[PDB]
Homo-oligomer: A and B are copies of this chain.
């Protein structure tokens, strides 16, 4: 379907080289479809993708699962915009607590609660199984090549 779009541009604006639209269109379509598959599993734990990401990132820090907002933001799988209202929501649900920084009275830290820890330890197991199932449509060799080519793209994008 992406090639069909490229063919439309070749007909309608032949003065332009629309070739860059192909890889990016495929990347973004894959990402939307992938997000749907991931959310289908997060929903079983009454979590959104951004909630899972925050809890998983606190889990990955290791006990006692305390991160500064900057550390949290920097080690999320995906960032996009302020955390203010999202952190407030996760505290309202009781999965994190904002705690005073003992080394700076004017700032705070984010800590995973016992209920957040219990939940994310179960959710990450299901998430990995879900991801393994999603990717099972690709041969191992294709997945490996895709991973290395994405890492090359990611390095280029981050270098900008």
Mark each residue of chain A from 123 to 138: 1 if its CB lies under 8 Å from any CB of chain B, else 0.
0110010011011011
Assess whether A84 is interfacial by the CB under 8 Å rule.
no
Assess whether A150 is interfacial by the CB under 8 Å rule.
yes
Each complex incorporates copies of this chain amounting to 2
Interface size of A by CB at 8 A reads 67
CA A55 to CA B156, docked complex, whole Å: 29
Give the residue of B35, B37, B121, B158 whose beta carbon is less than 8 angstroms from that of A33: B158
Are B150's CB and A26's CB within 8 A?
Answer: yes
Which chain A residues have a beta carbon within 8 Å of chain B's beta carbons?
1-2, 4-5, 8-9, 11-13, 16-35, 37-38, 59-62, 75, 77-80, 121, 124-125, 128, 131-132, 134-135, 137-138, 142-143, 145-147, 149-160
Nearest first, the 5 A-B pairs at minimum CB distance are A137-B156, A31-B31, A20-B131, A8-B60, A146-B149
